[PDB]
Amino acid sequence: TLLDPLANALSHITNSERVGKREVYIKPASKLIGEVLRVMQKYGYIGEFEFIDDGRAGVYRVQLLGKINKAGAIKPRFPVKARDYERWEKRFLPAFEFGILIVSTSQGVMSHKEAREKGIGGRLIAYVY
Amino acid sequence: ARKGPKRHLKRLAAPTSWYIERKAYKWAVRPRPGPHNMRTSIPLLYIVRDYLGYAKTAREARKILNEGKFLVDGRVRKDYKFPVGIMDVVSIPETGEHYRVLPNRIGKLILHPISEEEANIKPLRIRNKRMVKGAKIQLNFHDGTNHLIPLSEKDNYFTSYTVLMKVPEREILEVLPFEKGAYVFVTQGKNVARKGRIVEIKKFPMGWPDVVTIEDEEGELFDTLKEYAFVVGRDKPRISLP
Amino acid sequence: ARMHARKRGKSGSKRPPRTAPPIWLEYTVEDIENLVVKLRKEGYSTAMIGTILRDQYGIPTVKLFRDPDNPNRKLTITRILEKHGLAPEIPEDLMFLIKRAVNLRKHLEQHPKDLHSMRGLQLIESKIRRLVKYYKRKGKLPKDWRYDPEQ
Amino acid sequence: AIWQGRSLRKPSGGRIVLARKKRKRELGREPSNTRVAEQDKRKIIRTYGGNKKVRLTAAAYANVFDKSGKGRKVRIIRVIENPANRQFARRNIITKGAIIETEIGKAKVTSRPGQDGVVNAILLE
Amino acid sequence: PGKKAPNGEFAGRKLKLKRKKFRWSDIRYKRRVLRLKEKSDPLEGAPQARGIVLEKIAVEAKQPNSGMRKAVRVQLIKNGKVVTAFCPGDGAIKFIDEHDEVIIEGIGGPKGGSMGDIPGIRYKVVKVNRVSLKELVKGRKEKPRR
Amino acid sequence: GDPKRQRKKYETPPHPWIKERLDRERVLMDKYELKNKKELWKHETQLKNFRRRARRLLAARGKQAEIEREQLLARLKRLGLLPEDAVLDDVLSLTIEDILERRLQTIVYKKGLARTMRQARQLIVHGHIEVNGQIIRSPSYLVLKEEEDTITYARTSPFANPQHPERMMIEKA
Amino acid sequence: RDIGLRIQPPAEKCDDPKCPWHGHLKIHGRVFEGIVVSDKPRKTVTVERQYYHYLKKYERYELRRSRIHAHNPPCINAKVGDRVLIAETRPLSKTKHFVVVAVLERA
RNA sequence: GAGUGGUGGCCACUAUUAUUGGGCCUAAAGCGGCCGUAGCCGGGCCCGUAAGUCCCUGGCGAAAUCCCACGGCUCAACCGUGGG
RNA sequence: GGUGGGGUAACGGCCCACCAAGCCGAAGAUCGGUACGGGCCGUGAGAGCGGGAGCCCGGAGAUGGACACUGAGACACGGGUCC
Ligand SMILES: [Mg+2]
Ligand SMILES: [Mg+2]
Ligand SMILES: [Mg+2]
Ligand SMILES: [Mg+2]
Ligand SMILES: [Mg+2]
Ligand SMILES: [Mg+2]
Ligand SMILES: [Mg+2]
Ligand SMILES: [Mg+2]
Ligand SMILES: [Mg+2]
Ligand SMILES: [Mg+2]
Ligand SMILES: [Mg+2]
Ligand SMILES: [Mg+2]
Ligand SMILES: [Mg+2]
Ligand SMILES: [Zn+2]
User: What is the SS3 string spanning chain C?
Assistant: CCCCCCCCCCCCCCCCCCCCCCCCCCCCHHHHHHHHHHHHHCCCCHHHHHHHHHHHHCCCCCCCCECCCCCCCECCHHHHHHCCCCCCCCCHHHHHHHHHHHHHHHHHHHCCCCHHHHHHHHHHHHHHHHHHHHHHHHCCCCCCCCCCCCC
Q: Measure the CA–CA gap between B183 and F139, rounded to whole angstroms.
A: 62
Q: Which amino acid is at G41?
A: P
Q: C109 vs chain A: nearest CA distance in angstroms?
A: 39
Beta strands in chain B (DSSP E): 41-43, 71-72, 75-76, 83-85, 89-92, 97-103, 109-113, 121-132, 136-141, 146-149, 162-166, 171-176, 183-186, 195-202, 211-215, 221-225, 229-233
Q: Measure the CA–CA gap between C125 and C100, rounded to whole angstroms.
A: 10
Q: Which amino acid is at D73?
A: K
How would you class F105 by CB atoms within 10 Å of its CB: exposed for 0-12, middle for 13-18, buried for 19 or more?
A: buried
Return the domain boundaries, chain B: 1-119, 120-178, 179-242
Interface membership of A123 toward E (CB under 8 Å): no
Q: Do residues G63 and G52 lie in contact, with contact meaning Cβ atoms separated by under 8 Å?
A: yes
Q: G27 vs chain E: nearest CA distance in angstroms?
A: 36
Q: Measure the CA–CA gap between C100 and A19, rounded to whole angstroms.
A: 52
Report how far apart, in Å, the C-alpha atoms of E133 and of each of E70, E95, E101, F133 are: 14, 8, 12, 59
Distance A110 CA to I11 C1' (A): 58
Interface membership of A3 toward E (CB under 8 Å): no
Q: Measure the CA–CA gap between A114 and B53, rounded to whole angstroms.
A: 59
Give, as one character, the DSSP assignment of residue D26.
G
Protein CB footprint (7 Å) on chain I nucleotides:
1-18, 20-25, 27, 29-31, 38-42, 47-49, 51-52, 54-62, 66-68, 70-77
Backbone angles phi, psi at B186, to 5 degrees: -90, 135
C1' of nucleotide I72: residue with nearest CA: D49
Least Cα distance to C88 among C101, C76, C99, C79 occurs for: C79
My answer on whether omega of the bond before B242 falls inside 30° of 0, hence cis, is no
Residues from chain E that touch A76, judged by Cβ atoms under 8 A, are 7-9
Q: Do residues D96 and D111 lie in contact, with contact meaning Cβ atoms separated by under 8 Å?
A: yes
Find the radius of gyration of the CA atoms of chain B: 19
Interface contact G52-E9, CB threshold 8 A? no
CA dihedral F77, F83, F84, F86 (to 10 degrees): -90
Q: Is the CB of G42 under 7 A from strand I?
A: yes
Report how far apart, in Å, the C-alpha atoms of B208 and of each of B140, B204, C95, F13, F148 are: 22, 6, 61, 60, 64
Q: Measure the CA–CA gap between E110 and E88, rounded to whole angstroms.
A: 18
Q: Measure the CA–CA gap between A45 and A99, rounded to whole angstroms.
A: 10
How would you class F68 by CB atoms within 10 Å of its CB: exposed for 0-12, middle for 13-18, buried for 19 or more?
A: middle
Ligand at minimal distance from the CA of A106 is 7
Contact partners of C by the rule of 3+ C-beta pairs under 8 A? A
My answer on whether omega of the bond before A28 falls inside 30° of 0, hence cis, is no
Beta strands in D4-118 (DSSP E): 34-36, 41-47, 51-59, 61-65, 71-81, 93-94, 99-102, 105-109
Q: Measure the CA–CA gap between G92 and G105, rounded to whole angstroms.
A: 26
Report how far apart, in Å, the C-alpha atoms of F142 and of each of A33, B53, B83, F146 are: 63, 38, 49, 12
Q: Which amino acid is at A82?
A: A
Q: Which residues contact F120 (CB under 8 A, 6 or more apart)?
A: F105, F106, F108, F109, F113, F114, F139
Report how far apart, in Å, the C-alpha atoms of G83 and of each of G32, G47, G77, G102 are: 11, 9, 12, 9
Return the domain boundaries, chain A: 1-68, 69-129
Parallel, antiparallel or unpaired: strands D34-36 and D51-59? parallel
Q: Which amino acid is at D10?
A: K
Q: E16 vs chain A: nearest CA distance in angstroms?
A: 17
Residues from chain G that touch E8, judged by Cβ atoms under 8 A, are 60
DSSP B102-162: EE-SSS-EEEEE--TGGGGEEEEEEEEEEEETTTEEEEEETTS-EEEE-GGGTTS--TT-E
Q: Do residues B196 and B184 lie in contact, with contact meaning Cβ atoms separated by under 8 Å?
A: yes
E36 C-alpha to ligand 2 centroid (Å): 20
Q: Do chains E and D touch (3 or more CB pairs under 8 A)?
A: no
C1' of nucleotide I2: residue with nearest CA: G42
Find the radius of gyration of the CA atoms of chain G: 15
Least Cα distance to C91 among C140, C142, C149, C42 occurs for: C140
How would you class B242 by CB atoms within 10 Å of its CB: exposed for 0-12, middle for 13-18, buried for 19 or more?
A: exposed
Contact partners of F by the rule of 3+ C-beta pairs under 8 A? none
Longest dimension (CA), chain G: 54
Contact partners of E by the rule of 3+ C-beta pairs under 8 A? A, G
Least Cα distance to B43 among B69, B75, B17, B13 occurs for: B17
Q: Do residues G14 and G30 lie in contact, with contact meaning Cβ atoms separated by under 8 Å?
A: no
Return the domain boundaries, chain F: 16-173
Longest dimension (CA), chain D: 57
Three-state SS for F25-89 is: HHHHHHHHCCCCHHHHHHHHHHHHHHHHHHHHHHCCCCHHHHHHHHHHHHHHHHCCCCCCCCCHH
Longest dimension (CA), chain A: 45
Q: Is the CB of B46 under 7 A from strand H?
A: no
Provide the β-strand partners of residue G29: none
Report how far apart, in Å, the C-alpha atoms of A26 and of each of A45, A63, D65 are: 16, 11, 91
Q: Do residues E133 and E101 lie in contact, with contact meaning Cβ atoms separated by under 8 Å?
A: no
Domain that holds residue G72: 1-107
CA dihedral A7, A12, A13, A14 (to 10 degrees): 90
Least Cα distance to F147 among F96, F94, F117, F102 occurs for: F102
Provide the β-strand partners of residue B125: B162
HSE of D32, CA atoms in CB hemisphere, 13 A: 23
Q: Which amino acid is at B129?
A: K
Q: Determine what percent of chain D falls in helix, strand and coil, rounding each to the nearest 5.
A: 10, 45, 50
Q: From which experimental method does this structure derive? A: cryo-EM
Q: Measure the CA–CA gap between D60 and G29, rounded to whole angstroms.
A: 47
Residues from chain G that touch E9, judged by Cβ atoms under 8 A, are 60-61
Instruction: Give per-residue burial for A70-94: e unless 16+ CB within 10 Å, then b.
Output: bbebbbeeeebeeeebeebbeebbe
Q: Measure the CA–CA gap between G77 and G12, rounded to whole angstroms.
A: 11
Q: Do residues B41 and B83 lie in contact, with contact meaning Cβ atoms separated by under 8 Å?
A: yes
Give the three-state DSSP class for E68.
strand
Residues from chain C that touch A58, judged by Cβ atoms under 8 A, are none
Q: Do residues G69 and G41 lie in contact, with contact meaning Cβ atoms separated by under 8 Å?
A: no
Give the three-state DSSP class for A45.
coil
Q: Measure the CA–CA gap between C94 and E76, rounded to whole angstroms.
A: 83
Query: Helix A5-17 vs helix A31-42: angle between axes, to the nearest 10 degrees?
Result: 40
Residues from chain A that touch E9, judged by Cβ atoms under 8 A, are 76-77
Interface membership of D11 toward G (CB under 8 Å): yes
Q: Which residues contact B170 (CB under 8 A, 6 or more apart)?
A: B147
Q: Measure the CA–CA gap between B199 and B178, rounded to whole angstroms.
A: 11
My answer on whether omega of the bond before C91 falls inside 30° of 0, hence cis, is no
Q: Do residues E97 and E104 lie in contact, with contact meaning Cβ atoms separated by under 8 Å?
A: no
DSSP G46-104: EEEEEEEEEETTTTEEEEEEEEEEEE--TTT---TT-EEEEEE-S--SSS--EEEEEEE
Least Cα distance to A57 among B115, C17, B74, C68 occurs for: C17
Give, as one character, the DSSP assignment of residue B47.
I
Q: Determine what percent of chain E falls in helix, strand and coil, rounding each to the nearest 5.
A: 25, 30, 45
Q: Is the CB of D117 under 7 A from strand I?
A: no
Q: Do residues D34 and D113 lie in contact, with contact meaning Cβ atoms separated by under 8 Å?
A: yes
Report how far apart, in Å, the C-alpha atoms of D33 and of each of C6, C107, D95, D114, E119 are: 83, 83, 8, 8, 83
Q: Determine what percent of chain F falls in helix, strand and coil, rounding each to the nearest 5.
A: 50, 5, 40
Q: Which residues contact D54 (CB under 8 A, 6 or more apart)?
A: D42, D43, D44, D45, D116, D117
Residues making up chain A, counted from first to last: 129
Give CA angle at D83 (D78, D88), nearest 5°.
50
Q: Measure the CA–CA gap between B182 and B237, rounded to whole angstroms.
A: 9
Q: Measure the CA–CA gap between F48 and F76, rounded to whole angstroms.
A: 13
Interface membership of A55 toward C (CB under 8 Å): yes
Give the rounded distance of the alpha carbon of E130 from its chain centre: 21
Interface membership of G4 toward B (CB under 8 Å): yes
Interface contact E7-A75, CB threshold 8 A? yes
Q: Which amino acid is at G86?
A: I
H or E stretch at E70: strand E68-76
Q: Which amino acid is at C98?
A: I
Q: Dihedral sign, CA of F152, F156, F162, F165?
A: negative
Q: Which amino acid is at G2?
A: D
Write down which residues 185-224 in B have CB closer than 7 A to strand H. 188-191, 211, 222-224
Q: Do residues A34 and A51 lie in contact, with contact meaning Cβ atoms separated by under 8 Å?
A: yes
- Resolution reading in Å: 2.6
Q: Measure the CA–CA gap between C140 and B169, rounded to whole angstroms.
A: 87
